[PDB]
Scaffold this active site. Structure first.
Site, PDB file in Angstrom:
ATOM      1  N   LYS A 165       0.870  -1.180   0.000  1.00 20.79           N
ATOM      2  CA  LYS A 165       0.000   0.000   0.000  1.00 20.79           C
ATOM      3  C   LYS A 165       0.898   1.217   0.000  1.00 20.79           C
ATOM      4  O   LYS A 165       1.685   1.415   0.927  1.00 20.79           O
ATOM      5  CB  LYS A 165      -0.881   0.067   1.245  1.00 20.79           C
ATOM      6  CG  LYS A 165      -1.923  -1.033   1.410  1.00 20.79           C
ATOM      7  CD  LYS A 165      -2.441  -1.081   2.840  1.00 20.79           C
ATOM      8  CE  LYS A 165      -3.158   0.230   3.247  1.00 20.79           C
ATOM      9  NZ  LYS A 165      -4.526   0.003   3.797  1.00 20.79           N
ATOM     10  N   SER A 200      -1.254  -1.458  -4.300  1.00 19.50           N
ATOM     11  CA  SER A 200      -2.374  -0.521  -4.107  1.00 19.50           C
ATOM     12  C   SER A 200      -1.789   0.872  -3.870  1.00 19.50           C
ATOM     13  O   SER A 200      -0.592   1.033  -3.551  1.00 19.50           O
ATOM     14  CB  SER A 200      -3.218  -0.930  -2.886  1.00 19.50           C
ATOM     15  OG  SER A 200      -3.470  -2.320  -2.889  1.00 19.50           O
ATOM     16  N   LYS A 295     -12.624  -7.183 -12.879  1.00 19.54           N
ATOM     17  CA  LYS A 295     -12.806  -7.904 -11.644  1.00 19.54           C
ATOM     18  C   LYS A 295     -13.989  -8.871 -11.749  1.00 19.54           C
ATOM     19  O   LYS A 295     -13.957  -9.953 -11.148  1.00 19.54           O
ATOM     20  CB  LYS A 295     -12.987  -6.927 -10.482  1.00 19.54           C
ATOM     21  CG  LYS A 295     -11.723  -6.118 -10.195  1.00 19.54           C
ATOM     22  CD  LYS A 295     -11.746  -5.457  -8.817  1.00 19.54           C
ATOM     23  CE  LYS A 295     -12.765  -4.376  -8.730  1.00 19.54           C
ATOM     24  NZ  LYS A 295     -12.409  -3.288  -9.672  1.00 19.54           N
TER      25      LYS A 295
END
Lengths: 337, 330, 330, 337
Positions: A165, A200, A295
């Site tokens: 992240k 991310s 997705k």
């Protein structure tokens, strides 16, 4: 002299703020909230940069955990990795995977092979001039190395998933991916991808966070992780390879028993690098809903193989693993003799 | 005379791209007079106001009429044109060209039964009847008329019935049971093989029916299956298997190429519980697009062929799917 | 004792951003005990499954309870919290903090009538009653109860009635006429001043009513108007004018700043003809977002204040709008 | 010695392929299809790069015009500018504006002021290495100059709208805008915007096309054009200035008579350069539907002023006129004494 014991509990959420089943995990004495080292969740929502339902799930989960622990919510700041991926199209069921890890003094007998171990790292603060260039790549490689050492792993071939992240202002997810490739010796610093990085970026969080899942010969976990590479947008072989290398022996279809051996799957479905699939034109890069469709497709593939809607399907960002290749890891049961 | 049905799948890069379609005829590969149906997937949204859909319909009709050297309004009742809008994910836009001819000699060594095509037309349907018994038995009539056009009497030999009715959900449900009644699946509930459409103001419905016959000269055979839930690949595999591919669970690359086209309707499920868990597929604002995204993922992962006919996404847990597969002499 | 109602409009940069809201109280500017309603616009989609909406509701309640030093579940029936999701275009997310207090002395030189606030609660509403007469007169009851809470007896003095009912279109229509009946607009058709919501499982409805009274100590006054079609600014101007701004067609920058808040409900029109021409607003897949985009454009172009309460976008050609305007001593 | 006479007929379309009212324009003898020099349309659809309904309207309109003219559809290739802007949210009614122009030998008496004149230019073919840089900027400046000379206009202050269609691979619309600014002397070549450029890009068309609307003292048109600048996303003054400078005398609101004087409005609503409007934060740059919302807002503004849903509202691309400023032109009746 200490041996890690990692566990994973997958619990459903019917909305981003639904922590009922998550809370019941602890209240029943099934799981010790002090042992939790990571929460990895899929939330309903759009999955775009301004998906506030994602943040609602993040905030809700942290509060539930801090209560279960009896501490203020800002202790969990650097003790637990919370990772919420927004956007749950189609067959994907929103959920949270609760990862725990303690260390025990005696290594149980009769655990076959290697077993799951978890490591966590933190970057030096990343500044918006770093985002995207060498300075970010190196602050992330450091943290990947630090998580490896936290997990007691030295061999990069034993590392199967590295979640990073980072902060946002593509770039962050591109520089972070490279940092992992450098720390794993997949790419020499001097100079292009990582097979096992799932990146991310968002928020104003400045210290990056690395969650690393590997195996170790000295592991006390009743779990094992493996990975594979999704070669194109319609390929199930990457998923099957992750499951097989995690320790399920099958040719092409899983039995219902083998399906239930699979505890969780972590698949990142970035958009492909071209709009040609099996020699034909596809719309997946022109589509205004490309992020949601990517997705939706990934979830269809994974769930059609495991029959388990509570899978971690992330991605849908534009491309830049191998060309049009996507990582996927699977965590599978490893039982004593 | 024995029917010989054929299917040519040709890509489209946009709704008006008729290049490879036109080249089908110009190369002498296909006789534009033999074409009895065009079944296409177009890029677009797939909603009631998807104009790219209509653009593909208009574009294809014009190309076919030129290839035939006639005006575009003769093909009105001689060819079924069916464009399903919305091609998310792994679905490649394309048109399946169906031809049908009657030869006097039945080739030797064709195993089993073979593909045969039938067409019916409803008498004009009246907008208060849309949704009501008057539409039902008026399509049952056309389904019966399409069976007799294909020379099929056994309803267990019928594997796909496409119906296009007019729009104003219900049309698709009233059309479906008209098929169920005509196939003796229901006595005047559902149909395992109905694939329904609705749109436009065309008060005349159209039926396209795909079946098998022992006297077929086609080098093709059709089979069907039922998708049990939103994540189920077994319906697709059953369609392929009953069409004549012998496999346990995975197709070889050779067996994959035997599959010529798949026609799958992925209506939204009846509930939001899948394998004991809650899913978002009925709450999603893009449910219609996601449903087809998932269906395309399932089909293409099995056949490796992006040019598949994936339709559906209307609100409702079983969905039909048919497969057309090669049937080669001994 | 005479009511003193006030309104503080404070921005939010995200559904959970309660900084400027918390600073309202911490600076001593506002007494958190006096707050009787929070009315907010959040970023998000505005559809039934808009979770950012709920995030704003939860976030705001928590901030208010802290400012009050009580647990969050006392504010359950003491404060009306209303978050309308979806803030396209020129609409700036924000929360309007409404306070109300009873002072013993009525200040001198307050012209005309002044703003007063009333609140009512319905007895729990039963999901078969949702849409039916049982919901109607059970909200008419709460509307009557909110009038008596505000000390208002003349329905022509009531300019805005917000109703939040539970969800399962109709709730919003059954609630609307409950208001129309309680205001004598309809004898047991529509209400000019009803602004209806529905959602959650809260079987207890909530009514928030804004009116005027001769005995009001508020430095504010409310007025309303009716938006005649989708392009009409005259409803907005009438609301501002009847609230006490004297202008012909355009507001000066000074008159613009007199307008404190506007509450506009932009339901989709009943037809797709606007000024004799066809529009796409009922076919559009994003109709709910576009409706609010247009309403926000109209309101903000008149007041120059992006932090306006623009709600609506449900399927139905007249829409309500209220304006709250400064009323200053002589 | 020849004087231009330009006209504009606004006719509705109920779908991209609906040419009924367009065809009736010619069949009734109301309009001579040989006189048509431009078609400017709004179609229903998304307005994104892959909006095929837009192309469907383009193809449909060309076919209807070629039939009305009795020629093959590929004559109209360089004789008529066809410009379809997709995406018609809210109050925008799909339509086509038919622009005609003939030249007459005698200039009518009693036409007040200046009057509308139309000019058309063509670029040298633009190559994908040009797209975005100096080579494109100069091939467009040439065509703008060529359209000016086609319209018999030398003073750039008399030019109020320059539509450019370029090819795509933002860039094209940014380099084309600059070309207009250079050709109008708004910006010196050596070196930043044009107040009156409305740029498009798409398809594989390689020759650019310039449609220019100006005024001339020697005009025989019963129409006049003017322009203004929308200063922010909620501003009506740009629209009002275009209408006023086109020749309607009003303070703030138009009478119903004055409204009907306005024949067409051409407004491009690009997204703003920041997310602050009147000192407050707006969502219009974060919104996944920003392109559709921008046009929904612009349409609301224009139509609330003219009461005429058949207005040309284009735009919704991301920014880079003045900072957060958008052009708008209005064409208004100019009647003899």
């Amino acid at each position: 002299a200490r041996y890690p014991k990692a566990s994973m509990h997958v619990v459903p959420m019917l909305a981003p703020n639904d922590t009922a089943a998550f809370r019941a995990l602890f209240a029943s004495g099934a799981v010790d909230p002090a042992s939790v080292v990571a929460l990895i969740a899929k939330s309903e929502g759009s999955g775009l940069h301004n998906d506030h339902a994602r943040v609602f799930a993040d905030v809700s989960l942290r509060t539930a955990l801090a209560e279960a622990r009896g501490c203020p919510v800002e202790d969990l700041a650097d003790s637990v990795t919370v990772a919420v991926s927004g956007g749950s199209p189609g067959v994907i069921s929103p959920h949270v995977t609760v990862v725990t890890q303690e260390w025990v003094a005696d290594l149980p007998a009769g655990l076959p092979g290697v077993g799951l171990v978890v490591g966590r790292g933190h970057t030096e603060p990343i500044l918006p001039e770093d985002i995207g260039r060498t300075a970010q790549v190196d602050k992330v490689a450091d943290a990947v190395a630090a998580a490896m050492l936290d997990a007691g792993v030295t061999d990069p071939d034993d590392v199967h998933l590295v979640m990073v992240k980072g902060p946002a202002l593509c770039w962050s997810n591109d520089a972070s991916a490279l940092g992992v490739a450098v720390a794993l010796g997949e790419v020499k610093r001097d100079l292009l991808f990582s097979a096992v990085a799932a990146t991310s970026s968002g928020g104003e969080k400045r210290g990056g966070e690395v969650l690393l899942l590997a195996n170790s010969a000295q592991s006390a976990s009743e779990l094992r992780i493996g990975h594979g590479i999704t070669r194109d947008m319609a390929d199930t072989e990457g998923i099957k390879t992750a499951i097989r290398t995690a320790g399920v022996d099958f040719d092409c279809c899983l039995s219902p028993a083998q399906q239930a051996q699979v505890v969780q799957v972590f698949g990142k479905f970035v958009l492909p690098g071209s709009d040609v699939l099996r020699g034909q034109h596809i719309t997946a890069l022109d589509d205004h809903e490309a992020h949601h469709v990517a997705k939706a497709v990934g979830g269809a593939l994974v769930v059609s193989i495991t029959g388990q809607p509570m899978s971690f399907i992330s991605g849908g960002e534009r491309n830049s693993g191998p060309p049009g290749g996507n990582p996927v890891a699977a965590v599978v049961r490893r039982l004593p003799a």
